[PDB]
Design a protein around this ligand. Sequence first.
Ligand SMILES: *[C@@H]1O[C@H](CO)[C@@H](O)[C@H](O)[C@H]1NC(C)=O
Ligand SMILES: *[C@@H]1O[C@H](CO)[C@@H](O)[C@H](O)[C@H]1NC(C)=O
Lengths: 48, 53
Amino acid sequence: ENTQLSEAYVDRSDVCRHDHASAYKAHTASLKAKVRVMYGNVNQTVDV
Amino acid sequence: NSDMTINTCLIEQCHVSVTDHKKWQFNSPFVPRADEPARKGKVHIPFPLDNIT
Ligand SMILES: *[C@@H]1O[C@H](CO)[C@@H](O)[C@H](O)[C@H]1NC(C)=O
Ligand SMILES: *[C@@H]1O[C@H](CO)[C@@H](O)[C@H](O)[C@H]1NC(C)=O
């Protein structure tokens, strides 16, 4: 006349913030170039 | 902390167990629990993860 009570469950890892995988949904993308313009005496590159 | 004596009995008919609660120990799954509600504690462990090259 003796009973054992067994118990277990699942937890997120200790380093889940340090290595994990993210699932995303990707929508319309935005082009963003870096162009160099030259004429006369000007020599500049602009992020646009 | 006292030696105890009973008279007309054999060693087979007695069950004796030590009691000591001056120190905690780890919540191991190979040792049994004391109380069902299972009040417990916590202890920070060394050697955390870190970045190197
Ligand atoms: C200025 O324009 C010349 C081309 O005439 C280019 O070789 C040079 O890299 C430009 N200056 C800088 C700082 O990039
Ligand atoms: C390593 O550095 C990155 C930042 O680029 C940080 O997100 C990460 O948590 C760091 N890892 C550890 C174990 O500290």
